[PDB]
Write an enzyme that holds these catalytic residues in place. Structure first.
Site, short mmCIF file in Angstrom:
data_model
loop_
_atom_site.label_atom_id
_atom_site.label_comp_id
_atom_site.label_asym_id
_atom_site.label_seq_id
_atom_site.Cartn_x
_atom_site.Cartn_y
_atom_site.Cartn_z
N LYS A 212 -10.70 35.61 10.63
CA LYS A 212 -10.05 34.40 10.15
C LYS A 212 -11.18 33.34 10.01
O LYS A 212 -11.92 33.10 10.98
CB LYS A 212 -8.94 33.93 11.06
CG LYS A 212 -8.19 32.77 10.42
CD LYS A 212 -7.18 32.11 11.35
CE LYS A 212 -6.16 31.35 10.50
NZ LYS A 212 -5.86 30.02 11.07
N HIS B 265 2.21 25.69 11.34
CA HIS B 265 0.94 25.87 10.64
C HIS B 265 0.07 24.64 10.94
O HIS B 265 0.60 23.54 11.08
CB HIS B 265 1.25 26.16 9.15
CG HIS B 265 0.28 25.60 8.16
ND1 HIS B 265 -0.90 26.25 7.83
CD2 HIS B 265 0.36 24.52 7.34
CE1 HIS B 265 -1.52 25.55 6.89
NE2 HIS B 265 -0.78 24.51 6.58
N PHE B 266 -1.24 24.83 11.06
CA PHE B 266 -2.15 23.70 11.16
C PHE B 266 -2.71 23.41 9.75
O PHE B 266 -3.28 24.31 9.10
CB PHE B 266 -3.25 24.02 12.16
CG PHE B 266 -4.10 22.83 12.51
CD1 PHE B 266 -5.14 22.43 11.67
CD2 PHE B 266 -3.85 22.09 13.65
CE1 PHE B 266 -5.91 21.33 11.98
CE2 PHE B 266 -4.62 21.00 13.96
CZ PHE B 266 -5.65 20.61 13.13
N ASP B 267 -2.52 22.20 9.24
CA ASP B 267 -2.85 21.92 7.82
C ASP B 267 -4.21 21.27 7.68
O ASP B 267 -5.03 21.70 6.86
CB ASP B 267 -1.77 21.06 7.15
CG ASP B 267 -1.67 21.28 5.64
OD1 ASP B 267 -1.48 22.43 5.22
OD2 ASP B 267 -1.75 20.29 4.88
N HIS C 34 -3.36 28.28 17.80
CA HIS C 34 -3.84 26.90 17.86
C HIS C 34 -3.76 26.14 19.18
O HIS C 34 -4.42 25.10 19.28
CB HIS C 34 -3.09 26.04 16.85
CG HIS C 34 -3.20 26.54 15.46
ND1 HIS C 34 -4.38 26.46 14.73
CD2 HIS C 34 -2.30 27.17 14.67
CE1 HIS C 34 -4.18 27.00 13.55
NE2 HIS C 34 -2.94 27.43 13.48
#
Ligand SMILES: [Au+]
EC number: 4.6.1.18
Length: 124
Positions: free
Chosen positions: A41, A119-121, A12
């Site tokens: 992904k 984590h990117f939510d 990210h």
């Protein structure tokens, strides 16, 4: 082995003012960061802010994660990002992506000690 914190960076973090690339940014980036390696992904976001400004999000606005956990955090200011979203006709190992530039508030899940993003939510 790769820490969850290092994995978040690989997946990210792209500290720049905005997306720069020679050719389609997501196709190049998703590949260079190993996101087309075992599968395409399907969706992924890169953040063009310093690591420090992103890490700081973990002590900002606490929000529920999409999966029901409570360790997610929403940035107070908007950040410069790029969403990569896999095309209709994209098919592993031939991963292809649509590139969408934005300035939004980012939401990350934070974990561990130091308590850093993992984590990117979402973006809002
Ligand atoms: Au992630």
């Amino acid at each position: 082995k790769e820490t969850a914190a290092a994995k978040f960076e690989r997946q990210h973090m792209d500290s720049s003012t905005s997306a720069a690339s020679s050719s389609n940014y997501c196709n190049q980036m998703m590949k260079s960061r190993n996101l087309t390696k075992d599968r395409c992904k399907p969706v992924n976001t890169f953040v063009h802010e310093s690591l420090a400004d992103v890490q700081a999000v973990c002590s900002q606005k606490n929000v529920a994660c999409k999966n029901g956990q409570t360790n997610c955090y929403q940035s107070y200011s908007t950040m410069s990002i790029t969403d990569c979203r896999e095309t209709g006709s994209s098919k592993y190992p031939n991963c292809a992506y649509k590139t969408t530039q934005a300035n939004k508030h980012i939401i990350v899940a934070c974990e561990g000690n130091p308590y850093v993003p993992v984590h990117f939510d979402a973006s809002v």
